[PDB]
Write a protein that binds this DNA or RNA. Structure first.
Lengths: 805, 46
RNA sequence: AUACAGUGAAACUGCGAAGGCUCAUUAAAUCAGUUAUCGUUUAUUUGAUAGUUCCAUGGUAUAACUGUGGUAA
RNA sequence: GAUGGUAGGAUAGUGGCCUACCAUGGUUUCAACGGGUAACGGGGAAUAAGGGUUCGAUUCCGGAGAGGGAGCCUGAGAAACGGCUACCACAUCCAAGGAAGGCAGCAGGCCAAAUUACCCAAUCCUAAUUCAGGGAGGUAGUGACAAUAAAUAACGAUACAGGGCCCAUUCGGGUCUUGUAAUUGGAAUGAGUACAAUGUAAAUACCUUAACGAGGAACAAUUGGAGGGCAAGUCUGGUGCCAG
């Protein structure tokens, strides 16, 4: 027996006194056997406490098996041997055989997103993805201990990096080093030996706080005031959280009970139970609401809302993947996808989930629009809310499982969930001088991710740039942008020569999907038996199947983003891309200048993205060749995925031009099955492919015109007779549908077309009928544009007839 | 059973009485425990 | 004791357990003796009981064992 | 299928044991067939005991069952206490993906809830064996129903008293070595404490047995009954000092 320390029990005492989570990091081998003692201390600090405990691991438990019949018969045959007596258990065996432990792999961390735990035991340290960190430290509640065990390689990294700034020596990872430094900065975290000594490198001093909640008392006061009918029953069933959440539920109830249409959109963070408030308001809406409601979540992702709906219904008055069917006993509600229920929107109330903005504008038109805006884009959705609908949208961000937590602050700081849209420039007109200058500098990512204060403030600015209104990336993407071997960045922020300060005008992350460098990194990582870092090369290596692209290295754009001010920000992004093309063609400090004049031996430079209109316009100012796409509907936005790749190298122009030619040849046929998107964007894509072909080719891929007997075989003679019947008569479907496929094929092959005639050629390629495509695009002079299309068909038929026959 | 040692954790008034890279941990607990007090910045003159 | 050589965890092997409780009421049909089976089965016990040969040694395929692993088990 | 015949099937083989065909048989008042229990009782089923005369030794009540019927498998021997398949219910783990066995069992209880320890030494049984074993089997312990024979004293000396006992309604009568916290003396041993050896696989116990072990022999047996007597005491009654 020995007294341990004056700080490690007192930390749990004041952590449960202030209802704040706390972090222990244990080193050494005999470290599993001190989680009994920390769990006992966590319970005896306050009995009125959750008891469950997580054991997130990655591949294998430390010294046990988590199967109680298995270890029971193992200890039975241990009894039968006789090295251990009958009524004997060491405290770790007793801990795992009596406590309530939930076991998860590091891969399936998404299965425990909702429940609550008193303790979390992170077993392995060397692999810790930040999405898993954000999912476990969120579910640990206010009297909570998160413990993290270590390994001898991490002990070497600790003894190295605990002096000033040194690192470990062999893909190298710096996210775990940033983690170690953040835990050195945290006040509610410390590092303990396996013998319960203290390493005071992480929050050394800690006093026992004095023995003893106004916002909670104001919550109880306003709740009891609302109590003194079924509205108070719903309010008391909902308000398991802050008075902010209670006031939000009460205000949404008041504005959406009898007022039938308002557009209320409650916005909140990952805490505070937004889905809980929605599901707890669902029962009150079913009471004083219409017989049908419309939910717009993801399919089979409405766990908290459906649980709170069933819970509040059972509170008041009740009784291919999963069951989300509608039930009633004395009501209807369906969790549907995008608005195929346009004619099935007789429900007067629809509640949507967080951000698909055009699909949201499609679905939210003619009913009471409740909406849940999770932070986990928001500015543009609030702008679209104010641009149309008595919008009473208001919500707040007080936490649910705490009142405020330094563990939540350190988690947000390390995982970089904090953002700031302040300007902090020299001037906007002087940043327009940077847009004329097109000057860019490299990141120096090792010194960037080494956690120093001003470096971390600029890195938070860089993370706000790299995820500012992006395409819904995540913290694991931040860990890939930090700790991958094939990565670089560029911050083309300031042109000025002032003192310490600046901004971020444009971040752009490259990915060296190479041949030489990627082959070196892959042959390295095959010893570690993993690796997947070649996407843009491997897409074309199966779609177009070119040994030239198998031999040529490539840079691929992971992401690139600018400010959200104005079209000058897109000009700044274009200047950043042009500066990056010039950069490819022509401890440590947290920037680089001479290395911005340095590069590798890369052949191709490509950006892979979704088929967006402004992204296509950026790809055209980029003019990088609009290469082979994929029309499989990626269910996030339904957007098709195109990887536009320039060739900026010595001798690759014929290869890239032939690839663009093959993509152009495939796109006209693949616009029949699963590409029915637009007319102007389709013309822009065809023009981009032909522009790539004209820029790359000199006379190599120069196609010959429509030959005589081949053109005679492609049409029929009576088909051309019907074409002349359309020339001097009506252009009906008895002669304008059998030949229209060959007409559109030869028209997009090879002698000019108008805007209306180009939309007619694209309309016959998309094979829709007359009153659909032209009336959607031009919306003016329908029969006159049909006659202009017939005249262009007559000119094409007269040209083909007078050419061949 | 508080006031007693369920397992090893014997609870006194305020103190807790428990019982039971090698040289690296032993040295970092012997001398270099609070030696990293003024080792935070490493010339981080922000 | 430079193809085996004693201790021997865990594996194949020979055998071990070689005969233990409750519940609904069958009148020489349950039972006991006896006659017979050239009318029949039989490990073990015991006594007996085998006559065809044209122009120096026969084949891969599995363990135990190693090695790579999956699964809460 | 009742009774038999002929042939085949199946059998370890005999066999209406089963099937085709055929004949209309067969048992019975010389007790067919059917009726029940002190069929938790009986029949020799068996040992008998030197006086218990239907208590008094045992094999077997009938057949089943391993949650419930069904089907299959193994073996010299089986429709297996130890196997599999499917159906139906119980039922535990579970990370909800799946892996199972049977414990829906046996012991107990309704002011004696502890038997579940040691051995094959004996008798048999199996056994490759001059060896191994058997919860077959034996041994021991807690768990009183005052049922059973013993003890809690035996023998002397001295002193000092004069009264003790019995009958009877009464008066009274009859009788005689009888008493005493009196002193005192040396002998006896038993409960207990214990050497052992014997016994026994071993240990307990019985048996045999050296050493110590009594004066309040305090090494301290009860239970119930009959009757008094006492205070500067207390209470009640009322024709002093009394009665209760």
């Amino acid at each position: 027996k020995k007294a341990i320390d004056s700080r490690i029990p007192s930390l749990i005492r004041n952590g449960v006194q202030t209802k704040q989570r706390s972090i222990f990091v244990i080193v050494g081998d005999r470290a599993r056997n001190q989680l009994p003692n920390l769990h006992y201390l966590m319970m005896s600090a306050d009995l009125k406490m959750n008891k469950s405990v997580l054991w997130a691991y990655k591949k294998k438990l430390l010294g046990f098996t988590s199967h109680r019949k298995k270890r029971e018969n193992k200890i039975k045959k241990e009894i039968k041997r006789g090295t251990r007596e009958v009524n004997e258990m060491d405290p770790f065996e007793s801990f795992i055989s009596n406590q309530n432990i939930r076991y998860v792999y590091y891969k399936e961390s998404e299965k425990i997103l909702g429940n609550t735990y008193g303790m979390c035991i992170l077993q392995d340290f060397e692999a810790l993805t930040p999405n898993l960190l954000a999912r476990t430290i969120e579910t640990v509640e206010g009297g909570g201990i998160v413990v993290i065990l270590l390994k001898s390689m991490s002990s070497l990294k600790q003894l190295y990096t605990m002096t000033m700034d040194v690192h470990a020596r062999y893909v190298v990872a710096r996210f775990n080093e940033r983690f170690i430094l953040s835990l050195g900065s945290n006040p509610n975290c410390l590092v303990v030996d396996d013998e319960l000594n203290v390493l005071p490198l992480s929050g050394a001093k800690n006093v026992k706080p004095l023995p003893p909640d106004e916002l909670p008392p104001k919550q109880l006061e306003l709740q009891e005031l609302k109590e003194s009918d079924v509205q108070p029953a719903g309010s008391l069933v909902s308000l398991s959280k802050t008075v902010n959440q209670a006031h939000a539920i009460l205000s949404f109830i008041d504005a959406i009970s009898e007022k039938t249409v308002a557009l209320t959109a409650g916005r909140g963070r990952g805490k505070s139970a937004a889905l809980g408030i929605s599901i707890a308001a669902a029962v009150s809406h079913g009471y004083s609401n219409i017989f049908v409601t419309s939910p717009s979540p993801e399919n089979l992702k409405t766990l908290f809302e459906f649980i709170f709906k069933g819970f509040d219904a059972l509170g008041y008055q009740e009784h291919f993947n999963k069951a989300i069917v509608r039930v009633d006993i004395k009501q209807y509600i369906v969790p549907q996808d995008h608005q195929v229920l346009g004619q099935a929107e007789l429900v007067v109330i629809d509640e949507a989930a967080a951000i698909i903005v055009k699909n949201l504008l499609g679905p939210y038109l003619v009913f009471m629009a409740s909406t849940i805006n999770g932070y986990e884009l928001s500015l543009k959705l609030i702008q679209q809310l104010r641009n149309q609908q008595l919008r009473e949208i208001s919500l707040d961000e007080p936490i649910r499982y705490a009142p405020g937590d330094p563990i939540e602050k350190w988690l947000n700081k390390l995982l970089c969930l904090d953002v700031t849209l302040i300007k902090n420039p020299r001037f906007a007109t002087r940043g327009t001088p940077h847009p004329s200058q097109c000057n860019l500098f490299v990141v120096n990512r090792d010194t960037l991710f080494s956690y120093h204060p001003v470096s971390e403030n600029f890195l938070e600015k860089m993370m706000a740039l790299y995820v500012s209104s992006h395409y819904k990336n995540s913290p694991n993407d931040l860990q890939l942008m930090s700790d991958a071997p094939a990565h670089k960045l560029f911050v083309l922020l300031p042109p000025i020569d002032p003192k310490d300060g600046g901004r971020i005008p444009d971040p752009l992350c490259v990915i060296q999907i190479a041949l030489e460098g990627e082959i070196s990194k892959e042959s390295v990582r095959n010893s570690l038996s993993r690796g997947q870092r070649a996407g843009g090369d491997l897409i074309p290596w199966l779609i177009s199947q070119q040994f030239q692209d198998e031999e040529f290295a490539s840079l691929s754009g992971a992401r690139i983003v600018r400010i959200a001010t104005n079209p000058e920000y897109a000009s700044m992004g274009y200047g950043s891309r042009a500066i990056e093309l010039l950069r490819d063609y022509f401890l440590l400090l947290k920037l680089s200048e001479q290395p911005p004049h340095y590069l590798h031996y890369l052949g191709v430079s490509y950006g892979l993205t979704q088929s967006l209109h402004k992204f296509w316009k950026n790809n055209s100012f980029v003019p990088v060749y609009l290469r082979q796409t994929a029309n499989d509907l990626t269910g996030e936005h339904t957007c098709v995925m195109l990887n536009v790749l320039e060739g900026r190298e010595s001798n690759w122009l014929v290869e890239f031009a032939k690839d663009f030619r093959k993509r152009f040849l495939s796109l006209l046929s693949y616009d029949f099955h699963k590409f029915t998107a637009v007319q102007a964007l389709s013309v822009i894509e065809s023009s981009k492919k032909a522009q790539d072909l004209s820029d790359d080719e000199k006379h190599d891929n120069k196609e010959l015109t429509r030959t005589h007997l081949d053109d005679i075989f492609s049409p029929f003679d009576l088909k051309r007779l019907d074409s002349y019947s359309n020339n001097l008569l009506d252009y009906h479907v008895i002669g304008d549908m059998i030949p229209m496929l060959a007409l559109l094929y030869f028209g997009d092959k090879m002698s000019s077309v108008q805007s209306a005639i180009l939309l007619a050629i694209g309309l016959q390629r998309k094979n829709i009928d007359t009153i659909a495509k032209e009336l959607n695009l031009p919306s003016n002079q329908t029969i006159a544009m049909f006659a202009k299309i017939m005249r262009k068909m007559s000119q094409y038929f007269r040209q083909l007839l007078s050419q061949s026959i | 059973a508080p006031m007693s040692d369920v397992g090893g954790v014997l609870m006194d008034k305020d103190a807790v009485y428990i019982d039971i890279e090698r040289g690296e941990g032993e040295k970092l607990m012997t001398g270099l425990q609070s030696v990293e007090q003024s080792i935070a910045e490493k010339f981080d003159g922000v």
